[PDB]
Amino acid sequence: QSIINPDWNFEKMGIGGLDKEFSDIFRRAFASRVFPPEIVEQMGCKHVKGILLYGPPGCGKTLLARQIGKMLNAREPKVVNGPEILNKYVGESEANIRKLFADAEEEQRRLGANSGLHIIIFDEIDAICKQRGSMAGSTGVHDTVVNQLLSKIDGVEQLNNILVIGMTNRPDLIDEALLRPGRLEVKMEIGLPDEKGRLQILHIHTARMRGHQLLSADVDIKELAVETKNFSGAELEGLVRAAQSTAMNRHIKASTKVEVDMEKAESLQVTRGDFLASLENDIKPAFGTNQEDYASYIMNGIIKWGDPVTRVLDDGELLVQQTKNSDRTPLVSVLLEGPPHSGKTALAAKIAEESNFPFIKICSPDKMIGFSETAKCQAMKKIFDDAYKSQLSCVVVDDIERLLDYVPIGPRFSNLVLQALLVLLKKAPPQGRKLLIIGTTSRKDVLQEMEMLNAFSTTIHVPNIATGEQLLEALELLGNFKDKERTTIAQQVKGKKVWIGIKKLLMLIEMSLQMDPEYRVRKFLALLREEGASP
Amino acid sequence: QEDYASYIMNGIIKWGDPVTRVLDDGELLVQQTKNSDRTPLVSVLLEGPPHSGKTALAAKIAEESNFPFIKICSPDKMIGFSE
Amino acid sequence: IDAICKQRGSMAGSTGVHDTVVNQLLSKIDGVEQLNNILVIGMTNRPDLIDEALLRPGRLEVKMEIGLPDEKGRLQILHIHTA
Ligand SMILES: Nc1ncnc2c1ncn2[C@@H]1O[C@H](COP(=O)(O)OP(=O)(O)OP(=O)(O)O)[C@@H](O)[C@H]1O
Ligand SMILES: Nc1ncnc2c1ncn2[C@@H]1O[C@H](COP(=O)(O)OP(=O)(O)OP(=O)(O)O)[C@@H](O)[C@H]1O
Ligand SMILES: Nc1ncnc2c1ncn2[C@@H]1O[C@H](COP(=O)(O)OP(=O)(O)OP(=O)(O)O)[C@@H](O)[C@H]1O
DSSP: OOSBOTTOOSGGGOOOSOHHHHHHHHHHHTGGGSSOHHHHHHHTOOOOOOEEEEOSSSSSHHHHHHHHHHTBSSSOOOOEESSOSOOSSTTHHHHHHHHHHHHHHHHHHHHGGGOOOOOOOEESGGGGOBOOOOSTTOOOSSOHHHHHHHHHHSSSSOOSSOOOEEEESOTTSBOGGGGSTTTSOEEEEOOOOOHHHHHHHHHHHHHGGGGGTOOOTTOOHHHHHHHSOSOOHHHHHHHHHHHHHHHHHTTOBOTTSOBOOSSSGGGOOOOHHHHHHHHHTTOOOSSSOOHHHHHHHSTTOOOOOSSHHHHHHHHHHHHHHHHHTOSSOOEEEEEEEOSTTSOOHHHHHHHHHHTOOSOOEEEOGGGOTTOOHHHHHHHHHHHHHHTTSSSSOOEEEOOHHHHTTOBTTTTBOOHHHHHHHHHHTSOOOSTTOOEEEEEEOSOHHHHHHTTOTTTSSOOEEOOOBOSHHHHHHHHHHHTOSOHHHHHHHHHHHTTSOOOBOHHHHHHHHHHHHTSOTTSHHHHHHHHHHHHOOOO | OHHHHHHOSSOOOOOSHHHHHHHHHHHHHHHHHHHOSSOOOOOOOOOOSSSSOHHHHHHHHHHHHOOSOOOOOOGGGOTTOOO | OTTTOOOSSSOOSSOSSSHHHHHHHHHHHSSSSOOSSOOOOOOOSOGGGSOGGGSSTTTSOOOOOOOOOOHHHHHHHHHHTTO
16 A cells, blocks of 8 residues: 555645755655565665754744645544643653554554554644753753653664654754754754745635636736745735735625625625735734834935935945845945934935845844843844845944943943954854845944954945035925025025034924024024034 | 922022023923924923022923823932832 | 662652662662672763762673774774665
């Protein structure tokens, strides 16, 4: 009797974007159980009896496990859902574990080489397979169970009709001894799909629904696939479900009571509008970008009041192009510096947005109020680790000076964060990927003295307003003072020089605007004069 | 109103122009924060020689704000607290 | 053997049976009575955690340390498996 079911077919499986992993798993697990036993005996080998999987949440682990379990024409697979074998009475946990393998042992001793096949699923293997303490005083809560499992999987007796599978999210906590090639040999990683993977996933989760004419011709599947970038597997299904629900909700109503129409429900259709709506406000990707942060950092937009803003943007674009289409330098960093209130964070955010990378994350101290240095180091480590799971990335560090906890008195600061950032600004990403880091600051000399400028590859300068003409141009662009007052103000500022940042100009304008209609110009001039220059 | 009754122990007496000047500059900031849209956050710092009566004027300005939420954070409710 | 045999006076969390087990094994392996047809073999990954009283001469004398082979060993290992 063949191991595989007579009618099994790959297309019925319903899996997309994991062809290579499935092929390798098949090759390493089942290839030896397909040809007649004579050749297998001649080669004198033993079948593998272990598998493992891991990855980030929502990638299709349980689905693959269940599919592989169903793919075999044998007994019904057992199941264990995390700590479901623990017990309070002494020694019962080990007896429970042993009970699982009794059937396989009996089968082997009875029928020998023609025995059947059995499967098991230690789902959440991490729950009861933590590393042994290996030290007196650190007795583990679950140690006898681990020892019993290790003994049974490969002990004084041999078995060749078993197969174990595991799934977890922390592959670095499993006991070391349980990962040698004799017990758990084949282990694979499940990652985020690619464009073709997303297309396949959307196609599989739509084929059926197209059977009964439930799709208008306005749905361009290729456009929908290309639009959604770096989406986990589950989120595509979530989007489709939400779109279907919102499309169906229009025919139904309720409010005071509940009722349903019967003359319109037979012409149900789903169009691209509902899809768009939901895509916008329904599913919030986890490894992507959203306009909320940009709206929070670009609150007042960007205005081209002179030449430097264009040069800065061009330099940013050049750096982005270099990192994107280069291979000898997979790590380039740029440091933005300038006087206070010069408006430097907004330019960084604009560059990051316009870069058009799949993944963008902003690490700012706003979310770390009152933390201890250990928490800050952990957060930075987590963010940088997360940034290592994409073919293109970009990270922005905001207000470095406030991150180091600097204070001129003493001076004082936190050394651990500085050491972590210094080590973390030279760690090349995993081979075959790219990265880009953009920083900001308001005190260049301090960093130059702490021996930090040898870690950054370049540097840009963001100046202030330098001449009355640029101030007048900015005022006109904002559109607050009209021509009549513009002439009077210009007649004054034109014959001198100014030194102010745009943010301070906005605040000054706002403060001035609160006075009487015909007293605004005088107070504005007085405030501008009192501001001073202080070169 | 208990907090205001506590931090203002003897009311306010106008002994000269500076009191009027301060109370008139406070309302300007209040109106700016209430009517503006390009600046949702505004801050002001009061300073003067010791024993000049700053807290009283601050409390009076806050009360005259007429805002629907006024909480005063003082250092006398955390005696013995750690950082 | 490490699972059952540990240093006496450590695992005291409702230890209904563990120290009694180890004491009984100590007594049985070599007590007032003597035998001449018993042979005890033990495999462990943590040599330094076993009880010293079980390491005395007459109970467990032979102690061998299995290590990684060398080039010659690798040669023999790969020759045996492919014959
Ligand atoms: N390639 C895929 N094609 C279709 N559906 C997929 C795919 N990958 C994952 N899924 C979806 O995964 C869902 C089941 O959740 P899943 O088992 O993937 O979560 P998980 O990764 O196991 O999460 P956890 O981290 O908690 O273990 C199903 O709805 C299934 O449609
Ligand atoms: N053309 C422009 N260039 C720069 N900033 C602009 C421009 N137009 C408007 N702005 C405003 O300038 C503000 C400057 O940003 P932000 O408030 O972070 O100040 P900053 O001076 O960069 O920071 P810091 O106070 O840390 O020195 C941005 O919020 C943006 O709204
Ligand atoms: N017009 C006034 N302006 C200010 N304070 C006044 C006025 N009239 C009376 N006072 C009294 O001033 C006192 C000031 O008390 P408070 O402890 O707040 O002083 P302070 O000088 O602001 O504080 P500190 O002692 O911390 O320097 C109030 O108790 C109030 O009784």
